[PDB]
Amino acid sequence: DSEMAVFGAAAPYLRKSEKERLEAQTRPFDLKKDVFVPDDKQEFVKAKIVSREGGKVTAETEYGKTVTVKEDQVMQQNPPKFDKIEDMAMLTFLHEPAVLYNLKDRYGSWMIYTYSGLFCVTVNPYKWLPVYTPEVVAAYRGKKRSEAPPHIFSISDNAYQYMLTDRENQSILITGESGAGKTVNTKRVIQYFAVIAAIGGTLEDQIIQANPALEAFGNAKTVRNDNSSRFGKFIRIHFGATGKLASADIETYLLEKSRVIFQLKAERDYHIFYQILSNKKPELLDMLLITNNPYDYAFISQGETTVASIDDAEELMATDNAFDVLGFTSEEKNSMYKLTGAIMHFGNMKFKLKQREEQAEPDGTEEADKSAYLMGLNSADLLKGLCHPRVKVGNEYVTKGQNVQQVIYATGALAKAVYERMFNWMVTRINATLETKQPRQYFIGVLDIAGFEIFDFNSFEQLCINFTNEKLQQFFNHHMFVLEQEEYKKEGIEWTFIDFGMDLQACIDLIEKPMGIMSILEEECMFPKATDMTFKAKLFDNHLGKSANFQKPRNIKGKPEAHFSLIHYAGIVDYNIIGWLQKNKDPLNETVVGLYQKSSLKLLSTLFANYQTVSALHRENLNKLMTNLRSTHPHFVRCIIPNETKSPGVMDNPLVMHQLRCNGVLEGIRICRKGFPNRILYGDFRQRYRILNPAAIPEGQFIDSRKGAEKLLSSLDIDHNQYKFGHTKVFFKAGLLGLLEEMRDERLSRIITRIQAQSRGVLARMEYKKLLERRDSLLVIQWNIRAFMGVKNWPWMKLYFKIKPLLKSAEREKEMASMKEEFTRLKEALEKSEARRKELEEKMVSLLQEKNDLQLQVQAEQDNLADAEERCD
Amino acid sequence: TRLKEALEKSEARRKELEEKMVSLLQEKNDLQLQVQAEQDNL
Amino acid sequence: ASKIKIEFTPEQIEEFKEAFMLFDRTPKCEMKITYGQCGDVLRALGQNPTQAEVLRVLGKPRQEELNTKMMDFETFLPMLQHISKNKDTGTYEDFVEGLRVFDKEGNGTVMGAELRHVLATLGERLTEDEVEKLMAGQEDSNGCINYEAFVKHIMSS
Ligand SMILES: Nc1ncnc2c1ncn2[C@@H]1O[C@H](COP(=O)(O)OP(=O)(O)O)[C@@H](O)[C@H]1O
């Protein structure tokens, strides 16, 4: 409590007070009677053992219930000295009840950030704490994992320090179910980095405001979350060599296109639609000339129209401000709202049979005129194109006749496609604005995936999100369980393999791999003769009865019809095939496209400047993301939803226990204790650990790396049974690496206190000389003023000053003297500039040769991949 | 005047070389992204 | 702590008086100097102490006392003489040896980022604006700062 003076009012929400610790040590306990007992209603209950009759061990719960269980009572409690523990891996007893109740107590005390092993675990507060103030960031500058209480700022700082030290790109992966705070944590990490950069132009402001700009377009309200993330995102921050902020970029993934026109009963549409309808900006409502009532249009008024938790007016205000600060011009902004208004006007299209001849004609043209004007199109041409698409067969442009259903579906598909191109153009624009000069050196990438969801009606675009959640969870399993259990064998370290039982490949192979559900969806998507019912049947003839992940649909308690049950990692989902084929194909009206290319607005043209099934593209992007992640150091921040009813504070034990089981938080700590979490090379260890024991390593005695590391380790007072040695890697355990780092820290701390005293003394001396010369300059100014007072304005000096132009010989001589000294300055500038230019040019030649060779091998490997995929058949 | 012309030309050439090497960074990071793409291909 | 009346020579008294009058931040006064400014004057006048040392010699004052109450020139002068007599400073070889371990290959250069990090959050905490303004003019192209030139510039300046 003596420290934390810089944490401010957020202090009680980070680390428990000292008096609380003192009274906690006084808590009654037994350590031979206090146990945990499984429960049917709740998960686990504290209990005291009254008797142990052989196998049966009778105990009384904390609620007074008397229970017995078959050897499951051995589940033991923990001494009261371990409560609200920052690094949860330090528990003497670690198991499901222990982690569950530690998290429960912490959240009850409004303690959300915990360190579980090497990864952070955060529970959604549903109550905006003041823990995110800039004062907290200023306090978290440079703090280590144990020097600070758990927080997202400390995870970001650890990633930044690892990037600086290891000289490696870092990746902060945020994981969790729908509405678990992933967007909040992402924005907080961006805020941390941006304010750190702002400590020492407007790039930080732009990267901060980037998130709400995409919140308006892509973040809509669903059943689970009021600000749900429809599109996965990966925000990359390129840092310069100095460590100052250099640049940034954003990579976005598939957006739920069905949301634009179709919403379930409890859902809304994208917030940009309802933000304009709040009429906080009168110009938008009438320049769009759309009606204020949100129920007038059929795209955005099928489910819910507003949520009490969201106030759309200031949301529109924030969106406008973000667009303004991002560098967008007025024309672009106005055209974007114009296109959005066209999107909600497209829902007003009315089409009727011409002469009951299965041909569509515009029943109403006023809304068609609105849509045509908004893009600057031709209303007659647009209506003709929609009513009659001019598809070209062979070399003949044959007009196709379609009924009202086909034309209305075509209108919906046009709306979906144009809004998707809108979103992608926005992403490209923000990437171009943020990707300024010098994007050099290493990068830190924050990954925010779409959360797992189980609605009442599951279909396509709910399988891609669950699949990418499966994939990221499998990546976590790979980087924790499998990779280290093989680095143990590769390094020649005595280890026995442990079956953690968390490998999600059967489910992923059931989806991702060829012949899988989405693979056969892709292959059947090219067949116009096929229908959804047959395809579904195909699913039952190709995967059912062979894989456990696939299962027959459930259709529980009169829920909306489900077509097949997929056993994902987070429970069981049940999907419907109806509507998948057209969603995967995504056809578009070519004549309407050609109308788009010749529109008045340059914006609409650049969206459709040119016009690969969506499923394959999404799979390729996902695999690209995994390949990026495998080449970076991951920092996992797993998020947990406390309660499904969005009530702050309250936790239901079954839900949280299940999501910790599925996320693999528990089994990610066994390897953090039973294994060797820390590791470093011999050479780096000897190079940066010399001060610990310079006696064991004399100068110039760097004969052997392994022998040097061994004698440095043995020459110290630390425990020597903790570490192991292997080929160019020492394997630490627990906080031993932290111990060595802190002895190095204290030694180099004495040294650097001396150095910093010297440096700030020199700084004081130079500021002293600066103030001295400033005072001397002011003295010269007042001295000239004193001379002026001495002369004032007696006309004798007026005659003198009139004489001065007559006699300017000395002035001209000084003129040529300055001219020749600046001649010398200009000449030396010329030679230095020419030398710099020739160095730059030779670097250009070398780099362009290297990049041409790289492009050649790129083409060669692309052809090799094509040949390999051909041979895959 | 001649020296000023020479200096302005040299500074303009240095500035265009600076933006050119910025472009070289842009394309080199694009090429590392491409390299990642081939590692994805395998 | 202890105050000693006679630890000076008469000429340096005149030099220190000139330094204080020409450096006194407050213009309305001539003779008194801010309590927090006294440490800055002492650091600027050729001798460089540590924060702990300047706290110890100043009797362990408070930051409110630093920024509210004043000091007199000849009252602070004996402490200046004491600090000058202390000379708790290292040498070039010791400095470069201590700073050498901030590298992975011993090439004679160290990254600017790691140097900033260890200057800020490894010992006596340094204000950021200081860590940028001291490294201005000596930063290299890719951040690999030759520590020998850095320390020799520090001591020379
Ligand atoms: N630290 C937090 N403080 C306050 N509210 C939070 C916090 N973390 C999450 N929330 C709330 O949780 C809900 C879902 O957050 P969000 O980031 O949208 O989750 P996800 O990205 O997983 O869908 C929102 O209402 C948000 O305000």
Ligand SMILES: [Mg+2]
């Ligand atoms: Mg989300």
